[PDB]
Amino acid sequence: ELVLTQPPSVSAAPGQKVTISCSGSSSNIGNNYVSWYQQLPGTAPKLLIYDNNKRPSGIPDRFSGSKSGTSATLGITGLQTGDEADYYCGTWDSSLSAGVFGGGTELTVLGQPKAAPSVTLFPPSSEELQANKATLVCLISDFYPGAVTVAWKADGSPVKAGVETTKPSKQSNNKYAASSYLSLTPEQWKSHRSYSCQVTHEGSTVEKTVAPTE
Amino acid sequence: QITLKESGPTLVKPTQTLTLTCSFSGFSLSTSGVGVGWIRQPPGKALEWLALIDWDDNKYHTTSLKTRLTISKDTSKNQVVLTMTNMDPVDTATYYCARIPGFLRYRNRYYYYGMDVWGQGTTVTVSSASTKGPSVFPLAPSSTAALGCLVKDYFPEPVTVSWNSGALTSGVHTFPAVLQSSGLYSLSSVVTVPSSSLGTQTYICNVNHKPSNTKVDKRVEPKSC
Amino acid sequence: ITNLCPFGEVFNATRFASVYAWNRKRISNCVADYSVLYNSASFSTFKCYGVSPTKLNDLCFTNVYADSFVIRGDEVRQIAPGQTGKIADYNYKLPDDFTGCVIAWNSNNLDSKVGGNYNYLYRLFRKSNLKPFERDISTEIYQAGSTPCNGVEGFNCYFPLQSYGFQPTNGVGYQPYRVVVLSFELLHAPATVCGP
Ligand SMILES: *[C@@H]1O[C@H](CO[C@@H]2O[C@@H](C)[C@@H](O)[C@@H](O)[C@@H]2O)[C@@H](O[C@@H]2O[C@H](CO)[C@@H](O[C@H]3O[C@H](CO[C@H]4O[C@H](CO)[C@@H](O)[C@H](O)[C@@H]4O)[C@@H](O)[C@H](O)[C@@H]3O)[C@H](O)[C@H]2NC(C)=O)[C@H](O)[C@H]1NC(C)=O
Ligand code: NI
Ligand code: NI
């Protein structure tokens, strides 16, 4: 498991202030120096802070760091859209005799109003059933911010065995889309009475259902 | 400035050994307190510290991986070499090296700056799968309406998907691939259309898989049910 | 002077010092049988300066000092006079006119440890080089960079001592070596230590 704990996500509006926290033990943060890293999508990480609160050359005053006890905090003020990235804490762990990274925090800069998702649940195609395969495809489109949770159920029972889900990606209209798949055998697809794809977004849960009875 | 570059295989078979080399410029591993570290990052997951080699030839490793990791350096060549044995598909990640400008140890106390300069990173995939072209199935419109096609069971990445040989661009979005437990990739591409054009306009998704020299076309039509 | 010289309390000591804080033992009024040491193949290094190792027993000296410590294998060559390097500059320095013996042997079965022995230290940073036979055991923070340290450890603000890290399966060059430096006194005063 992870010996450093970060919140999975954090969000604010442009110009506002956001803080990302990082908790550990005395074996790491409590007795060693904390460094912070920024990772824009598709590129290598980049050092933001070292020695708890110092900035390397090229990092503006907008980023600051602090450490108290066994917790560290990264503060980002005056948010710009270009600050959207994953942020990590790092340090040395004296017990493991090795370095450790936190789970990372995904920062979302809210420069667009909330948009509910459009959910479509496709049953297995006729050709796929003839090919002795079956795949439910739950597509999710036109939502903001890019954060959704997907759950599958067979006759009301939670399904996780054949579930694969993509991380949300930007659409051409700057909203976000995601997809999830449930791989079944034709027997399993015919055995259960109906299947559901439930999508949660900003507290609101919507769902679409399909049935082999049709 | 400091510049590091990783190099090595981009596809290894399961149980084989991965050998990565880090070539760097702008600093020396003969300097007191300087080390070179390794990090990896599976697709869509956190950074995972791997190993560090020290100017005085001290070596540190992630505990859960120590029996699989070997690290060495050649100061004259400005190179560090990391080998990881018994590679598993879960070891599929992007592997980085980085400079540690300050790393010192006094008995139980440490100073560890962190990693101030990271390499570009090289992506290593561990898979026993052989090259296979995809199967393409239509996602018939439910009845605005949504339609698409499912690109299934192909290896390796990538596939390119267009609609009507590039004629259809508006309302088209193609998703990133998923890796199934079988070791084969799947992908979807969806088009948002007005529900009044279902019986009028036609939609053909063209799937192109360069590694297997496979080019397949599928017509997406509304089901009669 | 009938009692033999207690070289056993030097070479067979239970604990040896870190090189930065080398231990010095006074040797006087004894019979110094140097023949058994030179004969023993258990020593990796037996260099003499100013004297002949085979003529060591035929000699008398004003006094004998024995310096002991533990260093890395590839650092034994730095104990010799006129040398440079992190040990010769920052930890233990022999003068150019040194007169005595340098004796060392491999202690990997005593000073290594599974997972690494990190207890032995050497001085990694110092403002200037050491005077011959000078001993520096201070622990003040070393300013490596340009920013003042104010005694606070940080980047380029370093504790001056570094651990060795002796692994049982290190190469011989990185294995621990115990070193005994016998310094012979060149004074014109009456002698104190003589061989048989
Ligand atoms: C420093 O200590 C070493 C180690 O021995 C230690 O000290 C002696 C006095 C004993 O108390 C041991 O129990 C300690 O561990 C000294 O080296 C040792 O010197 C001994 C003579 O003083 C010598 O004894 C015999 O050596 C020859 C035969 O040994 C054979 O058999 C033994 C097994 O008993 C075996 O280890 C060895 O390899 C041989 O095959 C022979 O000359 C005589 O029979 C003699 O009695 C020890 O072998 C030798 N080494 C060991 C490991 O005991 C050393 O003299 C001390 N030096 C100083 C300056 O004090
Ligand atoms: Ni069931
Ligand atoms: Ni190693």
Author numbering:
A (entry chain L): 1 to 214
B (entry chain H): 1 to 143, 150 to 231
C (entry chain A): 332 to 527
Wording from the paper:
To investigate the neutralizing mechanism of CT-P59, the crystal structure of the CT-P59 Fab/SARS-CoV-2 RBD complex was determined using X-ray crystallography at 2.7 Å resolution. The complex structure shows that CT-P59 binds to the receptor-binding motif (RBM) within SARS-CoV-2 RBD, which directly interacts with ACE2. Further, the interactions of the RBD with the heavy and light chains of CT-P59 bury a solvent-accessible surface area of 825 and 113 Å2, respectively, calculated by PISA26. Consistently, most of the interaction between the two proteins is mediated by the heavy chain involving all three complementarity determining regions (CDRs). In total, 16 residues from the CT-P59 heavy chain interact with 19 residues of the RBD at a distance cutoff of 4.5 Å. Of note, the β-hairpin structure of the CDR H3 of 18 amino acids plays a crucial role in the strong association with the RBD, by forming eight hydrogen bonds as well as hydrophobic interactions involving several of aromatic residues in the middle of the ACE2-binding surface. CT-P59 binding does not alter the overall conformation of the RBD structure in which the pairwise root-mean-square deviation between the Cα atoms of the two RBD structures is 0.89 Å over 193 atoms. However, the β5–β6 loop region (residues 473–488) of the RBD shows a local conformational change, which might be induced by the interaction with CT-P59. The structural superposition reveals that the heavy chain of CT-P59 overlaps completely with ACE2 protein, while the light chain overlaps partially with the receptor. Structural alignment of CT-P59 with SARS-CoV-2 S protein trimers showed that CT-P59 binds to RBD on the “up” conformation without any steric hindrance whereas it collides with the Asn343 glycosylated site on adjacent protomer in the “down” form.
As with SARS-CoV-1, causing an epidemic in 2002, SARS-CoV-2 was defined to utilize its own S protein to interact with ACE2 as a functional receptor for viral entry. The S1 subunit-containing RBD is responsible for viral attachment and entry, while the S2 subunit mediates cell membrane fusion following proteolytic activation. Here, we report a mAb, CT-P59, as a strong binder for SARS-CoV-2 RBD. CT-P59 inhibits SARS-CoV-2 infection via steric hindrance with ACE2 receptor and mitigates the infection symptoms both in vitro and in vivo.
